[model samples]
Target: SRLEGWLSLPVRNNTKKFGWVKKYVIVSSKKILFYDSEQDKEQSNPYMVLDIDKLFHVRPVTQTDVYRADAKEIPRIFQILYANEGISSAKNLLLLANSTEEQQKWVSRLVKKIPKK
Candidate 1:
């Protein structure tokens, strides 16, 4: 039951519950899981799930003035397309990384998981 990799990545606190926090992210060949706490990693429950089959592509953000002030220092900002059901179009989810290398690493890994059309 080994996962491909485990990374504690910074996920934006869009809900503004209590500022930013890094989520314990577990990536596998099938899906990625985000745990709210490190302790939650050992549990079956996950705060969020990004399914590979449901994802189409990951695009880097070259320029954007719409991001928050805290995101200014971030080197990597990418968005993913979450494919929808039926005739609905895909939805996007913004993600942040501290470095360009880390961002590319995630993009490559995620791109590999998607099945060829």
Candidate 2:
């Protein structure tokens, strides 16, 4: 499990070509975290944040062509309804969304306020 100070570490957003760490708490701690783009487990459509300014900076999508995201390839939009980003949250959301009765229970439970970006 990631520790408390781990959040400060930079996470490289490499969902396609290059996988590396990007975000970090420079002053507070000199730590760092690596981000591999292909390793994303969350199904939440990231397109929702592209137009937004704040979240845009958090995600450096410079090489747009190389980075082929789900929104681009998938035609059916409803099949992409997800609300979480972390591995644990993604797993739970999938299980809840799959089960008919469990949908209600997890919909309220899974929908949460995530950290900025």
Candidate 3:
């Protein structure tokens, strides 16, 4: 079975609108699935899935990058760079985590799934 778990994070969809929106994510070895609701699992068709093979890297996002001014209360987050263009021809995905530790954990989990270059 694939490594599985759930996380609700503020994800910014640059392709759509440059605003943070909460998304329910399902982590697995093969792919990371996104959903609008936890109960949505019972229904077919996930909102999106980031294929492990398509991932280029996951890096911690600096506060200055997210907000114009540095602030402590800002949530910890990271960006997922893909090997190819994403939806709407986007290049990366921004994911917000509850804490620095959580961000590191998520990055590690996703990184492990990507094949070495």
Candidate 4:
């Protein structure tokens, strides 16, 4: 019920800082929360919140998927296919892991937590 660590995520509409930003991501129970920094971990606020049930898939990113040109980054990448309450069919969340092993750890933890539907 717990997986917490640093992971890289694309900034939410940060036009000036257009790139992946390191975030303190924590997975607990049925929710995944992205914290801006480690210093604010204890705070109730979150940069983003993703309820586990909203997710459709959580697995390793494929070479044929988005960012296919960057073959070098295929290893450290994983993708989340989710559906929010908004009018959307498939919402993608691309997360960059610290390493290949770290990606597996995050994947397995999420798969285990997502109950059978």
lDDT of 1 by residue, 1-117 (tens): 423333434344565432334456666677767677756767777878877778877676654623443555345656667776632677766566656776677777676777742
Q: How does each model score on TM-score?
A: 0.70, 0.17, 0.72, 0.80
Candidate 2 C-alpha lDDT tens digits along 57-80: 111112332344333222211111
Q: What's the TM for model 1?
A: 0.70
- Candidate order by TM-score, decreasing, is 4, 3, 1, 2
Candidate ordering by lDDT (highest first):
4, 3, 1, 2
Local lDDT at 68 for model 1: 49
Q: Summarize candidate 3's per-residue lDDT along 1-117 as a digit string, tens digits.
A: 443444444444566435456677766766777777757767866887877777777777776655542354244676777755554454677776656677777788787777853
lDDT of 4 by residue, 1-117 (tens): 388888877654556443466688898888888898866777777878887777787888867654522565666778877777553676877777878898898888876787643
Instruction: Name the candidate that leads on lDDT.
Output: 4
After superposing candidate 2, which stretches have Cα over 4 Å from the reference?
A: 1-98, 112-117
**C-alpha positional error of residue 111 in candidate 4 after TM-score superposition, expressed in Å:** 1.7
Comparing 1 and 2 on TM-score, the stronger one? 1
- lDDT against the true structure, per candidate, is 0.61, 0.22, 0.65, 0.75
